[PDB]
Design a protein around this ligand. Structure first.
Ligand SMILES: CCCCCCCCCCCCCCCCCC(=O)OC[C@H](COP(=O)([O-])OCC[N+](C)(C)C)OC(=O)CCCCCCCCCCCCCCCCC
Ligand SMILES: CCCCCCCCCCCCCCCCCC(=O)OC[C@H](COP(=O)([O-])OCC[N+](C)(C)C)OC(=O)CCCCCCCCCCCCCCCCC
Ligand SMILES: CCCCCCCCCCCCCCCCCC(=O)OC[C@H](COP(=O)(O)OCCN)OC(=O)CCCCCCCCCCCCCCCCC
Ligand SMILES: CCCCCCCCCCCCCCCCCC(=O)OC[C@H](COP(=O)(O)OCCN)OC(=O)CCCCCCCCCCCCCCCCC
Ligand SMILES: CCCCCCCCCCCCCCCCCC(=O)OC[C@H](COP(=O)(O)OCCN)OC(=O)CCCCCCCCCCCCCCCCC
Ligand SMILES: CCCCCCCCCCCCCCCCCC(=O)OC[C@H](COP(=O)(O)OCCN)OC(=O)CCCCCCCCCCCCCCCCC
Ligand code: SF4
Ligand code: SF4
Ligand code: SF4
Lengths: 156, 311, 80, 381, 176, 70, 110, 97
């Protein structure tokens, strides 16, 4: 049908504009922040992908949780996640954000940031390299590319 | 016909503001030993379009506002004053050719602080109001030296006419007799637009959604490009053949782009002033030299018999 | 006058440049030879109409035509 | 009344400010936001297993904390590393010092507003992380410096690349110093800011640049020297006013002197083994693990049980780039520590943050949190 | 053995005082900083074209885990449990039994990659070079349980990556 | 390298070139092939209204020379 | 008339842009958010200093309002009187600044 | 003048990708148009290029195929598309293709 074609091209357009202009809010919790800063450094250079460096949380597209999530800061993580406008995404980076990591059996560590916020991309490593974090961000962009909001809206 | 002239003024203003963001990200790329955007478009040319469509379909931030009226009128005033600063600018010919275009631009630039003040009070955050009051105090501080430097240069112009300011500089750039005025004017226009190293708001409109925040952003870059064009006309004014206006148009365009790149090249070089440090810079460094040079530029066309013509 | 000036030029050179430029602006028009020609140019600029006179009979120093010799001349404005 | 702000966690730090307008009357840093209970997890793991926790304390000074823990365990074991392992430890400790001072200076400039030398110096930091990845396989947390020496010998051609890096790195220091040192805006943000007297710096437990910026002539590589720091020749920069600008200059000069030490370590690297040749502490080679019976037994028992450390308590302190980094290790005779207190300089520095930010303003608080190089991993453990 | 940073006294002749006042009024060091930033504008940037260009790595690199086989198809792992004994994160879980030909082999070999700290003690504790931490770092997942590898995933990693793992071990085993 | 910024500066320069080129060509179109009459002062407006009166076609820019006198 | 049409067009364009920016993202149906700052709940304390720099701006802007007809005043035939009064007004602006200096008036906004 | 050689090198980069069509192909798929010595090609269509005049990091690269394992990778290029025999060469783990 015609309207299916129109909403397919409109999904392609809005998915292009949302994946080619991702603005990250980076939680600099622990050692993974250093490798995020290397992913922003001139070698790997997030900014050429449209991924800007240190946007504010109230206009960011993706929350990168980069480091250990302790019990003392889990409500602050959820609060900053709730202040993010939609569509918001969460990238988990490194082992402590993913599943607790080297502090999995700790009394004071949230065992994975997916007990707190919904996580889209799990980037593994300790720390994952800046090239590996950039691979995870490009896989996030591909996940945004195959979204079907207006196609499902026309079919609902 | 005149409406076509108004639209061909105000639509390429918005296009040049859209691509100033790309030029800024590219220049601050290559000055920071990296690349700017080059993936989204061919050489990154689709980055402003992708950015604008991202900001315009984002969820609204849904603020609780102290006012509806000022919360809506602050972007409207910001964009209206950002577009109406372009109408007396000779490029070589202005849209609205008036006798007092310099004083017109000084007045309409003094009116731009109400956007900051209304958007700061129309947010419920007290920190946003403190940042907005500090930005308003900064802007009204540097408007003083804007007015006095502008007056001293127009003592060499002869009138408040902006088209006479091209006739004034036919034999020499006006940066040569007025380079201390030119450098204090340049830093003062840098401190008008909350531009680095004077950007304390990045170190007042955090309650707006992504759309209206983009509107404030594009009004701010319209102000940046406009004050660079005004500085170009006022100190580095180009040759004007009346039979071929494209010579002056190409020339002031190249100089204005180099001056906007100089803004981008200054923000990639310096740390931020602390607030009382740039208050010290205005009220205790720029203002005494500005007053002394105002006395000099009053008494100098009289002592040289170089009083400029009234008409 | 020599140690104070060096002290203020080392501590606050902005204020020294301020008072020096302001002092030159105050005193230097009273010493320039070109200052008289500012007044002589401003009185020579004809914003109004030079309304003619009725010739009563005894006025040798007033011309009857613009291209006549007698009257005010601006040869000095050309030459300077 | 007076103002009370909460600069919250939106590392990470919570700050409770009592302000009197523009001034700062009281600064309360609420920490613990990266408390992970490291030094309780150390108690259930062996000495080799507790080694990679030290990489993640000061996560911009990895091989330094590895070196301090390795020196603590080797002191309790009454064994010493071979000389080549000692020169490799001092070499990579000074490369780690360059890493930490680039992180310190460029983030201290980034927070104030100079965002450009960050990008200029993280390419050099990227090359030093390539040196870490070539020597150990990981770019940050190497687990390379071990009790007994190091884990593995330098790959061939690594020292030529450390030469090619060190030959060019002084120009990078010079262009950083061109952007910031004589810059009047950088001086106006750092000269009158956080003046620390020498007596209060000794009293508050400050260490490193936080002492040496205030004129105290104390460096643990000179006074209480470890592996081969009595055999290298370098100078110790000393401040004069105890402010943020002198501490900036001390860190730039420590980059200079680290380049000097790295040149001397490249020219004086001896031949030999890289582990202690006691196979009851350091594991044997894999070629002799797969041929000798004693070496297979020692491989089995070191990678399952580990070496037993004799009972005793030690406080081993080294000169990490943030200051005196100490390990108070208590061994009960088993192959696991009984106790491991981790002294880190940033804890006492962030304790002294409240005195250093009295009478200053709110935008001077970020300069004082910059001049104390605070990594909250080492603060909160 | 020590040096005084910032203990210079400025000169007080008219030359150097006028030099410092010219530096104040004419913004000379600010022009020096602009000159350094302008110098980096006209350099080639350090930016590689990822995904089409890759950052340089070494054969010691510790990426994704894999289980190797002998050059007869027999898997190298003989269930000795040294790698889960030395694993500082306790990310490895092993269960074993004799299989149908009497060989000492594992039935469970799990590595929780979200617990793993990627330090490679398992590959250096392994007496038969069975578990290796190979070259792969681009294995990000969209789901948490996809980073919980069982024995089948690790053997498929070994079969996928053996052509590169064997060459890295060949290039590096003389340092080990 | 550094010349990659130049497509963006080229597009921005064309966008800054369009308003002045537009207003120059529109002033030469709407005024009979010439510049727009600048009347900042009432004498200039008076001569402009005299032009509009002497042209007969209610256009200030229709010039009348020596062909209109005898 | 051309200037009023230009002001009306710019105000209309700005109103249309703010209208699009407040109507277009509202047509997304995303989700209603439940439970929608450095200071907790306190009153903003009045600062003396920001008011002082505001009044200092106002007074020096009045002095600028006196100084603005100088590019027209330099055309006069009483140039000695004009130069005297011009130097007198800029000197009174400078004396206002010097009195604002020396009596601790420009403090913590220096 | 050495601007002329810069322009000639740009024009022969246009000439080296098989004309304007291949030039725009590599421009929109790669965001980089420089030519290199074809080192090799795997069993999928990934092509592998060297240029030892570039700096260390740029001197080896890959142009990913348009179709691998049933996925149209004309725009969806992916880092994991490199087979492991090329992964030591491309990540500079060895000098040998
Ligand atoms: C001029 C400057 C630039 C202007 C903006 C850029 C130009 C493109 C403008 C149209 C963009 C596409 C429509 C808006 C974005 C829709 C995104 C979305 O989430 O849609 C789902 C929404 C809702 O779909 P839904 O019902 O599936 O909602 C999903 C969320 N739940 C189920 C939880 C509620 O779709 C719409 O609201 C439909 C909007 C109109 C569709 C397009 C019509 C033509 C538009 C032209
Ligand atoms: C329009 C085209 C471009 C124009 C030029 C602008 C481009 C160059 C920009 C460079 C980067 C600037 C970034 C922002 C910098 C802001 C900081 C700064 O510079 O602060 C200003 C600094 C502030 O001083 P300071 O903070 O550096 O020094 C310490 C100051 N005290 C002592 C008060 C603590 O200097 C000035 O205020 C000087 C302003 C210009 C002076 C011009 C004087 C001309 C010479 C007159 C004669 C002097 C001789 C004596 C009398 C002789 C009489 C015959
Ligand atoms: C009735 C039929 C018509 C229905 C209405 C539609 C009208 C036309 C609307 C514009 C075009 C819609 C189609 C959008 C693109 C769809 C295909 C797509 O997404 O292609 C992806 C491709 C980039 O591929 P990528 O995956 O990024 O590869 C990275 C390489 N390393 O992307 C590219 O190569 C470039 C993509 C560019 C997208 C188009 C340009 C942006 C939109 C411009 C118009 C709207 C905005 C106007 C200005 C806004 C304010 C400034
Ligand atoms: C004063 C002048 C101001 C100028 C402002 C704008 C400057 C930049 C202009 C754009 C420059 C060129 C951009 C080219 C983009 C890439 C086009 C393309 O090929 O997109 C591919 C995409 C998917 O195509 P597909 O069918 O998948 O093909 C795969 C084949 N195997 O297919 C698509 O995406 C569909 C096609 C989309 C085309 C969009 C082109 C850009 C539109 C930008 C908006 C503004 C245009 C200019 C307006 C003012 C000037 C008139
Ligand atoms: C909060 C509400 C919404 C806020 C957003 C909208 C308002 C703010 C932004 C727009 C500001 C409009 C300013 C209007 C007047 C500008 C000054 C002006 O007209 O100066 C130019 C000129 C004087 O020069 P001259 O050469 O002598 O005149 C030609 C004679 N040869 O004079 C002329 O040429 C005279 C031309 C005719 C008179 C023009 C009057 C315009 C209408 C009155 C003002 C409308 C706006 C009112 C609100 C202002 C802000 C609160
Ligand atoms: C007659 C000529 C025209 C004069 C009137 C027009 C002036 C134009 C410029 C306007 C300036 C407005 C502001 C003036 C304020 C002056 C007072 C002042 O600033 O005194 C304070 C200052 C010491 O600063 P402090 O208060 O300690 O601040 C702490 C910062 N670390 O104190 C000082 O640093 C000492 C400042 C006073 C002495 C300056 C001497 C300069 C001499 C230059 C050469 C001669 C010039 C001719 C004039 C005669 C001077 C005696
Ligand atoms: S996964 Fe590891 S290296 Fe990464 S932030 Fe956590 S502790 Fe640090
Ligand atoms: S790399 Fe380290 S943490 Fe990971 S499985 Fe091996 S021994 Fe355990
Ligand atoms: S992988 Fe190696 S160390 Fe682990 S149980 Fe198997 S044979 Fe033993």
């Amino acid at each position: 049908s015609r309207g299916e074609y129109v909403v397919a091209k409109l999904d392609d357009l809005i998915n292009w504009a949302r994946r080619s202009s991702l603005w990250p809010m980076t939680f600099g919790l622990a050692c993974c922040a250093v490798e995020m800063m290397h992913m922003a450094a001139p070698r790997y250079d997030m900014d050429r992908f449209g991924v800007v460096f240190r946007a504010s949380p109230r206009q960011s597209d993706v929350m990168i949780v980069a480091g250990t999530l302790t019990n003392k800061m889990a409500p602050a993580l959820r609060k900053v996640y709730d202040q993010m406008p939609e569509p918001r995404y969460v990238v988990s980076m490194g082992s402590c954000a993913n599943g607790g990591g080297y502090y999995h059996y700790s009394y004071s560590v949230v065992r994975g940031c997916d007990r707190i916020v919904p996580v889209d991309i799990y980037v593994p490593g300790c720390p994952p390299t800046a090239e590996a974090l950039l691979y995870g961000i490009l896989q996030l962009q591909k996940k945004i590319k195959r979204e079907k909001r207006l196609r499902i809206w026309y079919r609902r | 016909m005149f409406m076509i002239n108004v639209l061909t003024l105000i639509i390429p203003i918005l296009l040049a503001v859209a691509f100033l963001t790309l030029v800024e990200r590219k220049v601050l790329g290559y000055m920071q030993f990296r690349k700017g955007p080059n993936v989204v478009g061919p050489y990154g040319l689709l980055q402003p379009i992708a950015d604008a469509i991202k900001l315009f379909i984002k969820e609204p931030l849904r603020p609780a506002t102290s006012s509806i009226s000022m919360f809506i009128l602050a972007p409207i005033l910001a964009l209206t004053l950002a577009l109406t600063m372009w109408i007396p600018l000779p490029m070589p010919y202005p849209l609205i050719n008036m006798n007092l275009g310099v004083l017109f631009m000084l007045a309409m630039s003094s009116l731009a602080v109400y956007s900051i003040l209304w958007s700061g009070w129309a947010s419920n955050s007290k920190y946003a109001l403190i940042g907005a009051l500090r930005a308003v105090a900064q802007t009204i501080s540097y408007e003083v030296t804007l007015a006095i430097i502008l007056l001293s240069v127009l003592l060499m112009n002869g009138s408040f006419t902006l088209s006479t300011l091209i006739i004034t500089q036919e034999q020499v750039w006006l940066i040569f007799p007025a380079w201390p005025l030119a450098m204090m004017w340049f830093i003062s226009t840098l401190a008008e637009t909350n531009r680095a190293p004077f950007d304390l708001t990045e170190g007042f409109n955090v309650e707006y959604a992504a759309g209206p925040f983009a509107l404030f952003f594009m009004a701010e870059y319209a102000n940046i490009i406009m004050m660079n064009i005004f500085t170009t006309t006022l100190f580095l004014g180009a040759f004007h053949n009346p039979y071929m206006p494209e010579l002056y148009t190409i020339n002031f365009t190249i100089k204005s782009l180099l001056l906007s790149i100089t803004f981008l090249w200054i923000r990639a070089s310096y740390p931020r002033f602390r607030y009382d440090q740039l208050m010290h810079l205005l009220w205790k460094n720029f203002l005494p030299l500005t007053l002394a040079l105002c006395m000099w530029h009053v008494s100098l066309p009289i002592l040289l018999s170089s009083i400029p013509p009234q008409t | 006058v020599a140690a104070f000036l060096k002290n203020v030029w080392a501590k606050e050179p902005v204020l020294v440049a301020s008072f020096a430029i302001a002092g030159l602006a105050v005193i230097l028009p009273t010493l320039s030879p070109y200052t008289k020609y500012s007044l002589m140019i401003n009185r020579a600029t004809p914003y109004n109409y030079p309304v003619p006179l009725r010739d009563d009979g005894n006025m040798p120093d007033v011309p009857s035509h613009p291209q006549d010799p007698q009257g005010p001349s601006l040869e000095w404005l050309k030459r300077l | 009344s007076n103002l009370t702000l909460n600069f919250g966690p939106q590392g990470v730090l919570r700050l409770v400010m009592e302000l009197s307008g523009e001034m700062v009357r009281k600064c309360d840093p609420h920490i613990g936001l990266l408390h992970r209970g490291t030094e309780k997890l150390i108690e259930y793991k062996t000495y080799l297993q507790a080694l990679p926790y030290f990489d993640r304390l000061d996560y911009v000074s990895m091989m330094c904390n590895e070196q301090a823990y390795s020196l603590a365990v080797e002191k309790l074991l009454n064994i010493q590393p071979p000389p080549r392992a000692q020169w490799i430890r001092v070499l990579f400790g000074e490369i780690t010092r360059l890493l930490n001072h680039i992180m310190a200076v460029t983030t201290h400039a980034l927070d104030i507003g100079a965002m450009t030398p960050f990008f200029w110096m993280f390419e050099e930091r990227e090359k030093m992380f390539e040196f870490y990845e070539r020597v150990s396989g990981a770019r940050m947390h190497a687990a390379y410096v071990r009790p007994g020496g190091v884990h593995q010998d330098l790959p061939l051609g690594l020292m030529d690349d450390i030469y090619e890096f060190s030959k060019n790195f002084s120009l990078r220091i010079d262009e950083l110093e061109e952007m910031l040192t004589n810059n009047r805006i950088w001086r106006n943000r750092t000269v009158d800011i956080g003046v620390v007297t020498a007596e209060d710096a000794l009293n508050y437990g400050f260490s490193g640049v936080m002492l040496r910026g205030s004129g105290i002539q104390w460096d643990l590589r000179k006074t209480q020297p470890y592996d081969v720091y009595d055999q290298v020749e370098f100078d110790v920069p000393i401040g004069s006013r105890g402010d943020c600008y002198d501490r900036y200059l001390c860190r730039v000069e420590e980059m200079r002197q680290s380049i000097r030490i790295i040149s001397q370590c490249l020219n004086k690297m001896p031949p030999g083994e890289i582990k202690v040749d006691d196979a009851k502490v350091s594991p044997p080679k894999r070629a002799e693990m797969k041929t000798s019976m004693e070496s297979l037994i020692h491989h089995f028992k070191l990678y399952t049980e580990g070496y037993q450390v004799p009972p005793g308590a030690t406080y081993t302190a080294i000169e990490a780039p943030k200051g005196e980094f100490g390990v108070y290790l208590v061994s009960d005779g088993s192959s696991r520590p009984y106790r491991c207190k981790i002294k880190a300089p940033g804890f006492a520095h962030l304790a002294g943050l409240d005195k250093m930010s009295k009478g200053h303003m709110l935008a001077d608080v970020v300069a004082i949190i910059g001049t104390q190089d605070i990594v909250f991993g080492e603060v909160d453990r | 053995t020590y040096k005084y940073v910032n203990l210079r006294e400025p000169s007080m002749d008219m030359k150097s005082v006028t030099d410092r006042a010219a530096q104040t009024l004419l913004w000379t060091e600010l022009i020096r900083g602009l000159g350094m930033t302008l110098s980096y504008l006209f350099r080639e940037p350090a930016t590689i074209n990822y995904p089409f260009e890759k950052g340089p790595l070494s054969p010691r690199f510790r990426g994704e885990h894999a289980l190797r086989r002998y050059p007869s198809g027999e898997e190298r792992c003989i269930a000795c449990k040294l790698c889960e004994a030395v694993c500082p994160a306790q990310a490895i879980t092993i269960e074993a039994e004799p299989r149908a030909d009497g060989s000492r082999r594992t039935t469970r070999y799990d590595i929780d990659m979200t617990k793993c700290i990627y330090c490679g003690f398992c590959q250096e504790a392994c007496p038969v070079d069975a578990i290796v931490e190979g070259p792969n770092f681009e294995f990000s997942t969209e789901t948490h349980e996809e980073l919980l590898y069982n024995k089948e995933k690790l053997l498929n990693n070994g079969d996928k990556w053996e052509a590169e793992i064997a060459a890295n071990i060949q290039a590096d085993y003389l340092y080990r | 390298m550094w010349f990659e910024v130049l497509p963006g500066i080229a597009v921005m320069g064309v966008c800054l070139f369009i308003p002045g080129m537009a207003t120059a060509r529109i002033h030469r179109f709407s005024n009979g092939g010439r510049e727009k009459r600048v009347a900042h002062y009432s004498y200039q407006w008076y001569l402009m209204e005299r032009d509009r009166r002497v042209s007969g076609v209610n256009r200030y820019y229709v010039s009348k020379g020596l062909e209109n006198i005898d | 008339m051309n200037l009023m049409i230009t002001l009306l067009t710019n105000f209309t364009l700005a109103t249309l842009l703010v209208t699009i920016a407040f109507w277009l993202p509202q047509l997304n149906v995303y989700s209603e958010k439940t439970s929608p700052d450095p200071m907790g709940s306190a009153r903003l304390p009045f600062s003396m200093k920001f008011f002082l720099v505001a009044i200092t701006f106002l007074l020096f802007d009045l002095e600028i309002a006196l100084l603005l007809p100088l590019p027209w005043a330099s055309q006069t035939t009483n140039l000695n009187t004009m130069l005297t009064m011009a130097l007198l007004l800029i000197f009174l602006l400078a004396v206002s600044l010097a009195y604002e200096w020396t009596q601790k008036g420009l403090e913590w906004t220096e | 003048m050495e601007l002329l050689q810069v322009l000639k090198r740009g024009l022969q980069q246009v000439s080296g990708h098989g004309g304007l069509r291949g030039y725009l192909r590599v421009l929109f798929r790669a965001n980089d148009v420089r030519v290199g010595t074809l080192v090799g090609e795997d069993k999928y269509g990934n092509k592998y290029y060297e240029d030892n005049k570039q700096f260390f990091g740029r001197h080896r690269w890959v142009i990913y195929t348009t179709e691998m394992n049933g996925k149209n990778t004309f725009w969806d290029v992916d880092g994991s598309m490199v087979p492991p025999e090329w992964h030591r060469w491309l990540h500079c783990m060895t000098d040998d293709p």
